[PDB]
Ligand binder design. Sequence first.
Ligand SMILES: [Cl-]
Ligand SMILES: [Cl-]
Ligand SMILES: [Cl-]
Ligand SMILES: [Cl-]
Ligand code: NA
Ligand code: NA
Ligand code: NA
Ligand code: NA
Lengths: 281, 281, 281, 281
Amino acid sequence: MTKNQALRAALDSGRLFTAMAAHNPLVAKLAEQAGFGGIWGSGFELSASYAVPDANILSMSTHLEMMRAIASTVSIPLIADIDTGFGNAVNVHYVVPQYEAAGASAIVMEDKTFPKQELVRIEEFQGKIAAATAARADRDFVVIARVEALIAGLGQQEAVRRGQAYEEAGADAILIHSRQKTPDEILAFVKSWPGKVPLVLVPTAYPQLTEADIAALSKVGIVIYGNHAIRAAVGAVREVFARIRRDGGIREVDAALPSVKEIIELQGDERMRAVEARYLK
Amino acid sequence: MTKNQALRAALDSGRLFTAMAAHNPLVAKLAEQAGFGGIWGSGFELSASYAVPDANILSMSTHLEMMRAIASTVSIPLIADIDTGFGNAVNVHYVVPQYEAAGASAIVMEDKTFPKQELVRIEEFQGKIAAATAARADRDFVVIARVEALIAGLGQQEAVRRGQAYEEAGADAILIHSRQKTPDEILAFVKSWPGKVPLVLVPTAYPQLTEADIAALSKVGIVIYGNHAIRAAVGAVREVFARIRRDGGIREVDAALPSVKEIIELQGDERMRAVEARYLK
Amino acid sequence: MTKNQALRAALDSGRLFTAMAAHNPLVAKLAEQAGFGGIWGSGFELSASYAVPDANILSMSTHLEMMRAIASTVSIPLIADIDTGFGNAVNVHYVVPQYEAAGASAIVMEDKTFPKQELVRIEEFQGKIAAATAARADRDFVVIARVEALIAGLGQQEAVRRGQAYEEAGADAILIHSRQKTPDEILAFVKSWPGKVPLVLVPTAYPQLTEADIAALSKVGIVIYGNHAIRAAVGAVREVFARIRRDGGIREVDAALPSVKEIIELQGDERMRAVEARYLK
Amino acid sequence: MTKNQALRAALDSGRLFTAMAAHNPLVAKLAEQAGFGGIWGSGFELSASYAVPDANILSMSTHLEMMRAIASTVSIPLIADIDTGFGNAVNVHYVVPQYEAAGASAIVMEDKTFPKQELVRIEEFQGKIAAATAARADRDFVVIARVEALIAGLGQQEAVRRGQAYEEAGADAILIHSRQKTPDEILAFVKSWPGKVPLVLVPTAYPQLTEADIAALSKVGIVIYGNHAIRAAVGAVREVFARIRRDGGIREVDAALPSVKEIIELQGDERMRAVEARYLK
Ligand SMILES: [Cl-]
Ligand SMILES: [Cl-]
Ligand SMILES: [Cl-]
Ligand SMILES: [Cl-]
Ligand code: NA
Ligand code: NA
Ligand code: NA
Ligand code: NA
């Protein structure tokens, strides 16, 4: 199975597909090794790893090359965060094929306007979604529409009307996001979702909602961990930099770290040893 | 003081300058906040963050743009790892000015051959060093020669002859590296080093050697922590990915992580709020 | 004089500054040698050289690196086309400093909306312009506001109100564009322009308007040749590809071409010979 | 037929395949329209378009992205110039797959050393060639070995021994180059070439040798026009910049140029009109 089929196969089969965030290939590799179904090429995480606000500051090609870098590193499907398409349907049409070519198996686009109506018009986004499905070469590539209506405070009625409108435009799945610190809003949506396609959750704000709780929701097809990679990294590097400057060295801290040999193994040293062995003459 | 002056000022003043590794701008920012004197734009760390062996696999422009990204993020000096210059003196001449323009305050180049004599000839490297000092625009930019003779097993006599030869070619500082798991080899070198310029240590293999032990060595001007950033990151992301897949969620793990608000603050949200406030009209 | 001063000096002095389009460094070099005052880092030309419509398809970093490439090649000032700022004032604030750092001496931004009101609101653009002038480090860097009102068909009254509004927001110069195949519209504007800053023309559609005719217009400070580089290139490569395939070889066509030695000289072979001579040891 | 099959099919079929140089996608597009069999992603041309000596100055990723840009623009096969592999067999192993992924249907690598033995050892290059054929995913991707022995002055005997050694290592075709201003050296080689694979010519120095003369040589499978694109461009831009500065305008020169509408058509405006028409809602 190609990555696109692996992904599509998970959606059609009914399992719950788990996707972990990743701001670089090594991190994506570790997620693969930890057993997630796929990687999340988060715009937030990458812009965070660059110390820049997540407001379309990072160049679009910066995200694209990172996606290329990751897809060529892992064997599991990659879902790319392309925000709002970098423009209108025209931009979407030229963009999507580049992501598909970088190796992503799906892309996520939201109906928010660019730049900071909080959202674009329904018919306008339907058009941006149709442009996406048309632009793709392999029918397996998944296109996920992201409804930001709840975040907007437009209401549940409008959120479902958008999700349904997007589904009719050709969206393969719907990512519905919620602000509330309680997963009441999200659940309410799931329960009333009438559309035929799978839903996507990014339960970052309501960490009380487990995979078991989401698996219980037949309508949710994918779960996405949106920013734990960068958070895990920040928390640990920060603490280790504090210990080094408090201890005035790395005599106490070295022991608690992965060894250098472990980093070389994650770099793909084995593959390199075979190459050197059979071709370096 | 410009970054180049800050660095040069530390070398002339006699303090011990501490440099921490960094594979991305956020990590570099955290090092700055932890109080290191400067950042180390490590080739090992970056190629590691890309899951590729550190054997000149990563494109030279990949390292260059990361250095540009970091220098524009931190206010402290950046020392760039340019390996062996990406070729000969000609390559060195065209390369150095690009690094200086990305914003690095120094570059580190080694006398190893490319690709895998383990080393290049003395006169050849002297020439690559002279080409570097000539190519630089601001005389403050620091050029550090890296003697790999100990690693080569050519001996102490040859290591000092190289370091001295490089110093006469114009090298501002000498990075001398050692394999031994004990800092016996390194110390021996320091003690017999007759050259007039400052020495650089990257005590990664002998973590028993503290900053106090190195400060005791009047001849060492800079200490470099070569790969603790990527190791700290790997160790923590790995553990958090294991917990999530063992717990089947992030209900237990979320509490132990830096919050999302903390990541937004590190992204430079404050600067962005002021901009939006005064210019978004 | 730094490039920024050279440019600013031309604006304050009253001469007419000529800027030629360029889609790559070699072409920019040739323009310098032909004697233009500066280079025009055209979005149209670059997207054209990439066979893509000029509708914000090319990545923003693609244009940025080309500008970096050109500024490091020529010694004359470079004016970068940044279209509409790649977003709103926030985007403008983060963007401008990158262009200034690539080496551009000025940037041109237009009040058209993104993506396809044909224009943004006056106060909104004023804000995008103020964000630009605030974001710049060297006060000499020039910020040029581009009024697209005539193109919009909003009228002369509105075009001058925008140009004046932009000037009060801090715009150093005003680029006013016209559709008409006759330079009647443009002239009318110039004559009625009351603002204190210099005007910019890109007389591409009305080629009957010479530099003498524009020099006659005391209010115009800069003349820009918008797309003759790419047109000159297309016309000649096309003809030479036709001759080769019609002649079944390059026996007839080789004579009419610049020699290979001439291309090596434009590559900077002389500088390379000196480097090899003094540092390749 | 995929591009790789189109190429391979030309080699097996016995026709003479013509390849034209190209330093950017538009130029490559024009070559396609002029009817060449394929494009030549020349390192010389690209480094020339950047005003830098062709001595491995341009970043490897700079060439790679240009190849990606071109392959996504044309429908005919692209042959990428990868020089000497950017290192040894290890570098070759990691590199080739990136070029294959950018979309190239073949790569050309030479047995010259890096950086400036003029050549590497026979067994060493055999190894670099075997590493290339092993690294490729689609068996159709073509690997072309480039023998620089004549240029080296090692002689004909040694040139054929290399070409044969490379063929046994798995090289699909042999590019043999000559200095002489007369095609005597080249012909001599062709006549004595005993190997089973097709030969490649880049008759740049002996323009008296037509496609008919080369078609007469049953052993030559591909003809490559190495630098006429950049030469054609330089000659015309130079002349047009001279006329503009001599005429003090573009009133005389505009008439002799391709129109702006013609450039928009080459940018793919038609495709964009359809997209805007069916998806911009
Ligand atoms: Cl990273
Ligand atoms: Cl990165
Ligand atoms: Cl070009
Ligand atoms: Cl280009
Ligand atoms: Na990153
Ligand atoms: Na990284
Ligand atoms: Na170009
Ligand atoms: Na080019």
